From a paper:
In [name] ([name]-[name]-2) and its closely related [name]-[name], a single copy of the [name] ([name], [name]) encoded within the polyprotein (pp) 1a and 1ab mediates its self-cleavage (autoprocessing) at its termini (nsp4/[name] and [name]/nsp6) and other cleavages between nsp6 and nsp16. The fully active mature [name] is a homodimer, with one active site per monomer, and exhibits a monomer-dimer dissociation constant (Kdimer) in the low micromolar range. The active site consists of a Cys145-His41 catalytic dyad. Domains I (residues 8–101) and II (residues 102–184) exhibit a chymotrypsin-like fold, and domain III (residues 201–306), comprises a cluster of five alpha-helices connected to domain II by a long loop (residues 185–200).
To understand the structural implications of our solution measurements of the enzymatic activity and inhibition of [name]–199, we obtained its room-temperature structure in the inhibitor-free form at 2.25 Å resolution. [name]–199 crystallizes with two independent molecules present in the asymmetric unit of P212121 space group that lacks a crystallographic 2-fold axis. The two independent molecules of [name]–199 do not form a native dimer. We modeled residues 7–188 in both independent molecules in [name]–199, whereas the rest of the N-terminal and C-terminal residues are highly dynamic and are not visible in the electron density map. Indeed, an unwinding of the oxyanion loop is evident, starting from Gly143 that shifts by >4 Å away from the catalytic Cys145, opening the substrate binding subsite S1 wider. This conformational shift squeezes the stretch of residues 139–142 into a short 310 helix, which pulls a whole loop consisting of residues 130–138 closer to the newly formed helix by 1.2–1.6 Å. The organization of substrate binding subsite S1 is preserved in [name]–199 relative to its structure in MProWT even though the N-terminus of the second protomer that usually caps S1 as part of the mature homodimer is no longer present in the truncated enzyme. In the absence of the stabilizing effect of the N-terminus, the side chain of Glu166 rotates from its position observed in MProWT, where it hydrogen bonds the N-terminus of the second protomer toward the oxyanion loop. In the new conformation in [name]–199, Glu166 makes a 3.0 Å hydrogen bond with the main chain amide NH of Gly143 that was part of the oxyanion hole in MProWT. The structural studies presented above indicate that the catalytic domain encompassing the region 1–199 of [name] adopts a native-like fold for residues 7–188 with an unwound oxyanion loop conformation (E), which defines the catalytically inactive state of monomeric [name].
Residue numbers in the entry: 7 to 188
Write the structure that this text describes.
Amino acid sequence: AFPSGKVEGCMVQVTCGTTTLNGLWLDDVVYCPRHVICTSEDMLNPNYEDLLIRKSNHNFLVQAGNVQLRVIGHSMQNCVLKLKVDTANPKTPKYKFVRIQPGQTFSVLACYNGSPSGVYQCAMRPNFTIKGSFLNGSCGSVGFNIDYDCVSFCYMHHMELPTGVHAGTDLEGNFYGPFVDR
């Protein structure tokens, strides 16, 4: 329901090896789910600390349309990866990070490979999941609310559960509910 223009100008494509998903570009940092550094066999019992050390900056390919962002640093904050790039996003809006509760509504900008596809109003169920096919294949899409001119990011999609529901974190990397990225 919220207009998505301010958020569209922050969405990017993040690729590591064969994995490609959405990232959020604010200032000179790109936020994305940390399981992007995982391969197929990694996602069963991943050592995220060992994988972080194994990857170099040039293992990360970040694209904002045709502009290519050069990764000059990468750190991990809970379950989100933070990629420092060599350029600040000139379209960075006024923003803050907030943590919400189930039952509260927010708008989700569903993207695929960095391209905005739709915006939808939804809410987490009491078990901290979201039911909706609109998000299938949208790893890294973010949820948000607009407080006048400020964009409050409150959600990042991380994974689809076997039961067709979706799990995610806040922008500090803390999962909503008891879920784990393994």
